[PDB]
Amino acid sequence: GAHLARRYLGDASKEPDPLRMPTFPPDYGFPERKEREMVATQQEMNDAQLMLQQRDYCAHYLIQLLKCKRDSFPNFLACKHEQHDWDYCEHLDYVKRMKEFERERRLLQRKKRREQREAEMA
Amino acid sequence: YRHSIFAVTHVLIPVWIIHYYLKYHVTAKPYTVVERKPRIFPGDTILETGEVIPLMKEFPDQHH
Amino acid sequence: AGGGVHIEPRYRQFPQLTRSQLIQAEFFSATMWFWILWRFWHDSDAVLGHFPYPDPSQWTDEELGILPDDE
Amino acid sequence: HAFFKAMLFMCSGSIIHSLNDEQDIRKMGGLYKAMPFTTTALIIGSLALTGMPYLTGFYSKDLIIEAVNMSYTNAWALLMTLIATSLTAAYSTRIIFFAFLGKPRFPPLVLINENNPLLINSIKRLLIGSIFAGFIISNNIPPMTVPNTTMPLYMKMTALIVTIM
Amino acid sequence: AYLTHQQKVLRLYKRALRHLESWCVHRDKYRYFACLMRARFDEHKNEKDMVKATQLLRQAEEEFWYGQHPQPYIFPESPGGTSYERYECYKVPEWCLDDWHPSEKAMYPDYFAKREQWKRLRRESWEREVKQLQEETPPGGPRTEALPPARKEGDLPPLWWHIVTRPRERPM
Amino acid sequence: SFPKYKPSRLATLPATLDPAEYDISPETRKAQAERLAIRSRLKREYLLQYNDPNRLGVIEDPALIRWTYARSANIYPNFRPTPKTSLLGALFGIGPLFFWYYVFKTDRDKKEKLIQEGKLDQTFNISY
Amino acid sequence: DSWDKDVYPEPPRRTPAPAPQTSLPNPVTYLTKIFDLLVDRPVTLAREFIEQQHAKNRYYYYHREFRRVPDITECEEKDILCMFEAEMQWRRDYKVDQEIVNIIQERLKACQQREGESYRQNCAKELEQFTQVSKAFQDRYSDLGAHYSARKCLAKQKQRMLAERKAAKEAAA
Amino acid sequence: APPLTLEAIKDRVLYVLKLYDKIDPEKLSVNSHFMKDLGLDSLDQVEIIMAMEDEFGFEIPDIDAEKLMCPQEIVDYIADKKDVYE
Amino acid sequence: MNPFASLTLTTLIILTIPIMMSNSNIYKTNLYPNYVKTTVSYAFTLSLVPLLMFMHTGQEMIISNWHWMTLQTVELSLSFKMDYFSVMFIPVALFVTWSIMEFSMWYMHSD
Amino acid sequence: MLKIIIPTTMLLPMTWMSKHNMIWINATVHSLLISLISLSLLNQLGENSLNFSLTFFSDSLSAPLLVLTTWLLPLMLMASQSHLSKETTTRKKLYITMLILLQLFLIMTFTATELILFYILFEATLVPTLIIITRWGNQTERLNAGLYFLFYTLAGSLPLLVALVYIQNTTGSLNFLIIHYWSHPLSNSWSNIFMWLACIMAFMVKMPLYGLHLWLPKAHVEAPIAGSMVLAAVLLKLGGYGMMRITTILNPLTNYMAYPFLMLSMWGMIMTSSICLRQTDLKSLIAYSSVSHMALVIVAIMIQTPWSFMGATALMIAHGLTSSMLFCLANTNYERVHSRTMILARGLQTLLPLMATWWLMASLTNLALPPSINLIGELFIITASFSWSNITIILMGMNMMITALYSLYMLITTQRGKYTHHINNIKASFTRENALMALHILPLLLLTLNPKMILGPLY
Amino acid sequence: SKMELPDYKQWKIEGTPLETVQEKLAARGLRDPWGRNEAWRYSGGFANNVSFVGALLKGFKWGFAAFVVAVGAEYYLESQN
């Protein structure tokens, strides 16, 4: 919404392009940026036969969700802390994307006016 | 009793002749019935071989 | 007409209402009532979110790691 | 949708049978007290289509509005969805007003009745369906897509509010 | 024949008020508006020379033509109604009874007994009524579809059978 | 009474907005006397057989046989080689066949031109 | 089973043995148990009658054999005897080749359900195996026409073999 | 629909015609000529006939609406409309 | 796999039995509406069980038994794929029709 | 095949010296027995056609048509019983002789070995139908009907004769087995085009094809009912059986000159189906329907794909059972009402319960509900045509939609609605025409169970 | 079985919102004679219908009572356990 206004009714280059960004090396600006690591191995996703869109980094919690659920039968009112870890993982992973969105945003913000500063000093 | 005669002459004698049909004639043909592999858990065990699939290490445990 | 008429219609007056259709009616609306406040009290974190939405602006350039603007 | 859409269908039909095979709203009215069981049934189902929290419509319609909003669509795709929710609710309130509220714009012979046992029992199982099913099924079905956790608040609450004006 | 001047306005006034109750919906609101238009209808009840009322016709008929509801309340048995021409799938012509196997006719014995005398009643009546209708009709045929009465002695109304043996409106 | 409804071929002028409704001339109202008379006898003769118990089977409907005979037989005897008829004959004749001839020929030529050097999607097609 | 895994390879089946830590006992376990001993038991002994009756009088049926005859390539023009033999031999080989495509599709389809949502990564081997068979089938019998015959296929085989011969010399350069 | 017989219909129309404030109860008759016995005008005749329109539910053709004069033949008209005999 | 797929086959044939009895003209046309009630309600009753193992282990399969056409390379056979969508829709559909025609017995009776 | 030929010709003496009242019983029972004997012809090997004799052979294409003819013959026998009661015995036996002679020529036509022998009995069917159409017709126009039907078929028949005898002098034989086995590519020389042409319009004039179809509405709507079924059910298909035969040698010419007939047909059924929707006579619709259904067959044969040939065979047999049913259905209404106007007798469900069903799936088979063999033939044509050209789909898909449009239209305008009160002669539906429809419909669903027997030799 | 027709004396404009219709028309020298036909609908048991919020409020009184003792029961486990 707000970023939509800053691109459509504002400057498109100022806002990140959702289908193109990021456009800067993530290691650039973070010397020794540690890799977002995997908890559930390839065979974990493979043996669980998880679907691709839910085979993200949070899938390590997701397999735990089903396994309490597949063992909570009969009951369905159990299985609460399992998602509490999962949606929080998706909550923080969405923040990671959001942080990457703002990272590229202020990446575009900084360099454009830095180049504008060069355009001003010449 | 009417419910009972309903079951035998409309439900009970069916479940016999479908069961007779597929578990002796249909399953006797290859790939007639194919069942997906259940989601075997690293951490759970296999019933026939007794092999417990090794589970992954500690989760991030990001308790809210 | 034929034997079996029991519900007797009226003419411009409020019709008779057997208690059975009433008592279940407010019972069902009560049943559909107390279900959602019990669900509300038990799981208020369902209709409304359970995980906060951090504001974008408050994020400083540390996790953003934007190298300084002057250079 | 199959639950409550059907659920209001024979409830409307129960009104039609009781009120001498009439369909126009402009001849309904005053049926709240005189049509008790159907009145509750239609009242619930009218905004059950809109799906108040913790209902068949809640776990589907409210999530649908957020899901399209929390995704990559054309600018007008979302706006029709909120327009849908508002416009659907507006006449969802309308048909109650003409049917039960107001005054009985119906012929003087007061035949209006719903004492038939099959009438009550057929709809009765659809009260428990149209209200309980969304909760039980939602916890009975594992999620298929990534849940929408970090969300900028308003585009979820918008689905609930666009229903009430 | 031709629709008379005060007859045409009665037709237009008919559905115009049905349009009004379609618009007003509420009974009291309709009653208030129906009486207001009643006096409006009575505003120029006088017409004197017929040419003035023809112009008054044009404005009046133009009013009620636009006065239609977009979806006027058509009754279930109204032409185009929900229950209109609904049970025609059940009514069957009376002559089909003669095309019944004797078993069915015998298992409905009293009805076919009174059907037989009704069939007999059709015979002499048709005989008497046709020699009644031919001379009751003046030269040049029938000037109108109105059909002459059974004004003779011991005579049935001419051209009655299909009217009397009409498929009852509730065939069930 | 408002901006008036314009009559159309598939939705004609109503019985209200028609000028003849309020423009009833002495001869126009006079016309609705003999058309009623012929309808009266026409309705009469139908009743003299429809209500006739002696009559059995089906009575002839002159208009229906007039419609069928004119819709089936009397078109060629009334047909003329009029240039207009030949014009509509031509554009609805060889026209559409040449339309679909070119379309399918162009499609086939455009389709065929890539088969001989392997530029189509045919790998999973061994049925024809 | 009558069929063997060399013809129809069935991926091995594992059973994730449960662990119902929940207070309520599982409803499925005895629901399948009752279904077992109120329906299966009557039909098991009934089948035992059927299997034992088959053993009482077991007749025999064999498999029809076909002695190979000279091919259309070695057959004679305008000679209706030999080339008819090659014609029928070619048609039978077509029917067998049709069924080879059937089996590999059956094996491929069986793979997809076996791997479930992992069909994309765990069915590539069966897919490519069918792919090369289908490609070989396309240059084999496809495009011949409704009036296909041994001579018509031989012309197609010769046309393909001369095209690649010209291509091979072109590749030699 | 219950077997609505003419006796119910006959009572309803005369009651409504008595209910009609311009056809007073004491001056209402079974054969009430609206033009002569009751002295109403054409528009009131429309109001009378379309009052029983909504009051009875069924439809009165316009070519039969203006003809229908008296409550007795109002009763007979609805009598032949459904074909009541009891 | 002994339940579930077999149970679905039982559910979809018991609904045909009313038609088979109807065309056999041995059924009684009077209580047939009520006879239809019992069939649909029962067919719904056996529709719940195929859910139970899907909640339990989530197994899904395809039933293809009687081969109709060989059509050279493309064999044709009657085949039902029971997945998440099909499995839990049958009780939803079965419950709906049982209730709506339960209402329709009182409503649709004057014909 | 003389195990079918000899009993069939033996029907002539038996039907010609039977009793004055047993001619119907005797002819019906033994014709059905011939059908049962003909059912044994369903057996086919992998690809070898059953070569019973030098002059007779059959395969998976001839036998389904063979059974169709033999199974059909009792159906006009029972259909004609209605309107042939008011006739002398000698003339009645003459009618039976024409039908049996028509059957006998049909079996020899399908079982023929070489093309010339096939051609002789093929055309020979014109004579029995010419007498049937003209002598026993109903209206003045039937005289113009016979000439239109005769000359149209003959005008295309004679060029084929010249081409056929030309085959014998060039190839050396006209036997189908040798022609296919000694098949040689046909050059594109300007003479060879006419050579290709002369072997085509003979088959497509009686298909019928768009443009060259006017005899179809002028005969089927106008022939006696018994002649109407055999004309629509089988006689049109005589072009189909020939075209699968003659196409074995006429290659690769079909690639070029199929076009002028292809879109002539492709615009054809859509055009014809439009005429069906806007008819006024009952039998005129089914006649116009028959050419519309026959039109997709023309595309099926000409496109020369194995899938289309199977679709051609299935649609061929399915249409025969259908078109016979609707023509029988129209005859039932025409008899009581003594006319064939569509809206003359609308709304007869209230008086004709079983007929309204016999309307119902007969039209539904005309709509081709799944999995009726009509679609199995129709869908196979679609896949073959789509593989030929993608843009094909819109046309005949639109056609089978306008096909759907009318195929309920007479159902609405004959059964749905209110009876005509002046009509009072619709009596109780006699079991004869009633059971006639049963014998029409049950084989359709029976063949639906195991269609694998009617896809022809390409299956 | 009774099909009885009640008294007309109870059904004129009184006891109904038809007061205003009777006088507002009477303000412009008019009379409303058909309000008595709709007097029963605007009176008797058919009058005084609950509001829309009150329409959904039906069953709240017992629903609220069931709700509070249910969450009181909810507090029961977290205290007793």
Residue of K42, K45, K52 with shortest CB distance to D101: K52
Taking an 8 Å Cβ-Cβ cutoff, which residues of chain D contact chain H?
Answer: 20, 107-109, 111
Residues near K31 by Cβ (< 8 Å), separated by ≥ 6?
E35, H21, H22, K25
* Residue whose entry in the numeric block shows the structure tokens 């045509």: J385
Experimental method: cryo-EM
User: Are β-strands I76-82 and I61-69 bridged in parallel, bridged antiparallel, or unpaired?
Assistant: antiparallel
Window E:18-47, CB contacts with J under 8 Å: none
Q: Which residues pair with B45 in a beta bridge?
A: B52
Q: Which chain K residues have a beta carbon less than 8 Å from that of H55? A: 37
Question: J209: buried, middle or exposed (CB in 10 Å: 19+, 13-18, 0-12)?
Answer: buried
Q: What is the resolution of this structure in A?
A: 3.5
What is the rounded distance in angstroms from the CA atom of residue D42 to the CA atom of residue D114?
Answer: 14
Q: How far separated are the first and last CA of chain J, in Å rounded? A: 23
Backbone angles phi, psi at J203, to 5 degrees: -80, -35
Contact G39 B19 (CB under 8 A): yes
Q: Is D109 helix (H, G, I), strand (E, B) or coil?
A: strand
What is the rounded distance in angstroms from the CA atom of residue J160 to the CA atom of residue J122?
Answer: 12
Angle at D108 between CA D103 and CA D109, to 5 degrees: 120
Residue of E54, E65, E119 with shortest CB distance to F14: E65
Q: Is J114 helix (H, G, I), strand (E, B) or coil?
A: strand
Residue of I102, I103, I105 with shortest CB distance to D13: I103
Q: How far is CA J447 from CA J35, J365, J376, J441, in A?
A: 15, 13, 11, 10
3-state secondary structure D32-66: HHHCHHHHHHHHHHHHHCCCCCCCCCHHHHHHHHH
B37 touches chain A (CB under 8 A): yes
Nearest to C51 by CA among A53, A95, A66, D69: A95
What is the rounded distance in angstroms from the CA atom of residue I34 to the CA atom of residue I27?
Answer: 12
Chain A's closest residue to I54, CA to CA, is A70
Question: What amino acid is encoded at K54 in this protein?
Answer: G
Contact A102 C51 (CB under 8 A): no
* Residue whose entry in the numeric block shows the structure tokens 């009077």: I30
A53 touches chain G (CB under 8 A): no
Q: Which helix (H) or strand (E) holds J155?
A: helix J142-171
SS3 content of chain I, % helix, strand, coil (to 5): 60, 15, 25
What is the rounded distance in angstroms from the CA atom of residue J406 to the CA atom of residue J277?
Answer: 5
H57 touches chain C (CB under 8 A): no
What is the rounded distance in angstroms from the CA atom of residue C60 to the CA atom of residue C58?
Answer: 6
Residues near D4 by Cβ (< 8 Å), separated by ≥ 6?
D45, D48, D49, D56, D57, D130
Angle at E126 between CA E120 and CA E129, to 5 degrees: 135
Taking each continuous run of H as one helix and of E as one strand, the counts in chain J are 22, 0
List, comma-separated, the residues after which chain G is broken, a break being a C to N distance over 2.5 A; otherwise answer none.
Answer: none
DSSP code string of J22-44 = THHHHHHHHHHHHHHHHHGGG--
With touching defined as 3 or more inter-chain CB pairs under 8 Å, the answer for chains D and H is: yes
3-state secondary structure F53-72: CCCCCCCCCHHHHHHHHHHH
E36 touches chain K (CB under 8 A): yes
Q: Which residues pair with J58 in a beta bridge?
A: J50
CA I87, distance to chain mean position in Å, is 11
Nearest to K33 by CA among H16, C16, J276: H16
Q: Is I78 helix (H, G, I), strand (E, B) or coil?
A: strand
Cβ(I59)–Cβ(I53) below 8 Å:
yes
Residue of I6, I46, I59 with shortest CB distance to B11: I46
Q: Which chain J residues have a beta carbon less than 8 Å from that of I68? A: 451
Neighbour-count burial for E89-106, b at 16+ CB within 10 Å, e otherwise: eebebbbeeeeeeeeebe
DSSP assigned state of A19: T
Contact G22 A73 (CB under 8 A): yes
Residue of G18, G115, G121 with shortest CB distance to A71: G18
Dihedral, CA atoms, F99, F100, F106, F108, nearest 10 degrees? -170
Q: How far is CA J450 from CA E126, I70, J21, J36, J233, in A?
A: 61, 11, 39, 18, 21
Cβ(H20)–Cβ(H48) below 8 Å:
yes
What is the rounded distance in angstroms from the CA atom of residue J113 to the CA atom of residue J178?
Answer: 10
A54 touches chain B (CB under 8 A): no
3-state secondary structure B12-53: HHHHHHHHHHHHHHHCCCCCCEEECCCCCCCCCEECCCCCEC
Own/partner contacts of K24-27, CB < 8 Å, gap of 24 or more, are K24/E32, K25/E32, K25/E35, K25/E36
How many CA atoms lie less than 13 Å away from J335 in the CB half-sphere?
Answer: 19
* Residue whose entry in the numeric block shows the structure tokens 């197994």: I59
Count how many residues are written for chain F.
128
Q: How far is CA E90 from CA A4, E111, E172, H83, in A?
A: 64, 19, 7, 17
User: Catalytic: which of H24, H41, H62, H64?
Assistant: H41
Residue of D2, D13, D116 with shortest CB distance to I92: D2
What is the rounded distance in angstroms from the CA atom of residue A64 to the CA atom of residue A62?
Answer: 5
**What tokens appear for B61 in the block?**
């445990």
With touching defined as 3 or more inter-chain CB pairs under 8 Å, the answer for chains B and J is: no
What is the rounded distance in angstroms from the CA atom of residue K67 to the CA atom of residue K54?
Answer: 18
Q: Which chain H residues have a beta carbon less than 8 Å from that of D109? A: 4, 8, 12
Chain A's closest residue to B60, CA to CA, is A39
Backbone angles phi, psi at I80, to 5 degrees: -115, 125
A40 touches chain B (CB under 8 A): yes
DSSP assigned state of C58: T
Nearest to J290 by CA among J310, J272, J311, J313: J272
Q: Which chain A residues have a beta carbon less than 8 Å from that of D144? A: 51, 54
**Chains near B (3 or more Cβ pairs under 8 Å):** A, G, I
Interface probe for E, chosen from H41, H50, H64 (most Cβ of E below 10 Å), is: H50
Nearest to E29 by CA among K25, H13, D106, D29: K25
Contact H55 D111 (CB under 8 A): no
**H64 is known as an active-site residue:** no
Other CB atoms closer than 10 Å to residue J368's CB: what's the count? 24
Q: How far separated are the first and last CA of chain E, in Å rounded? A: 37
**What tokens appear for I45 in the block?**
């009753």
Contact I69 J452 (CB under 8 A): yes
Q: What does the longest C-alpha to C-alpha distance in chain G come to? A: 85
Q: Which residues pair with E135 in a beta bridge?
A: none
Cβ(G156)–Cβ(G145) below 8 Å:
no
Cβ(B16)–Cβ(A40) below 8 Å:
no
Other CB atoms closer than 10 Å to residue D157's CB: what's the count? 14
**What tokens appear for E55 in the block?**
């112009």
Count how many residues are written for chain A.
122
Residue B36, marked binder: no
K2 touches chain H (CB under 8 A): no
Q: Which chain E residues have a beta carbon less than 8 Å from that of H66? A: 7, 10
Q: Which chain B residues have a beta carbon less than 8 Å from that of I61? A: 33-36
Contact E32 K24 (CB under 8 A): yes
Phi-psi category of J195—alpha, beta or left, where left has phi over 0 and alpha has psi -120 to 50? alpha
Nearest to B10 by CA among I42, I32, I47, I97: I42
Q: Which residues pair with I80 in a beta bridge?
A: I63
What is the rounded distance in angstroms from the CA atom of residue C67 to the CA atom of residue A27?
Answer: 12
Contact E28 K34 (CB under 8 A): no
Other CB atoms closer than 10 Å to residue A113's CB: what's the count? 14
Q: Which chain H residues have a beta carbon less than 8 Å from that of D108? A: 12, 16, 55
Q: Which helix (H) or strand (E) holds I81?
A: strand I76-82
Nearest to J154 by CA among J222, J112, J206: J206
Contact H47 E170 (CB under 8 A): no
Cβ(G114)–Cβ(G8) below 8 Å:
no
Q: What does the longest C-alpha to C-alpha distance in chain B come to? A: 60
Q: Looking at CA atoms only, how far is residue G31 from chain A in angstroms?
A: 13
Contact C54 A91 (CB under 8 A): no
DSSP assigned state of J454: S
Phi-psi category of J102—alpha, beta or left, where left has phi over 0 and alpha has psi -120 to 50? alpha
DSSP assigned state of E56: H
Pairs of residues, one from chain E and one from chain K, whose beta carbons lie less than 8 Å apart: 36
Q: Looking at CA atoms only, how far is residue K46 from chain D in angstroms?
A: 6
Q: Is C10 helix (H, G, I), strand (E, B) or coil?
A: strand
Q: Where are the beta strands (DSSP E) in chain K?
A: none
Window I:8-47, CB contacts with G under 8 Å: none
Contact J306 G84 (CB under 8 A): no
**What tokens appear for A115 in the block?**
């180049």
Window E:67-126, CB contacts with F under 8 Å: 119, 122-123, 126
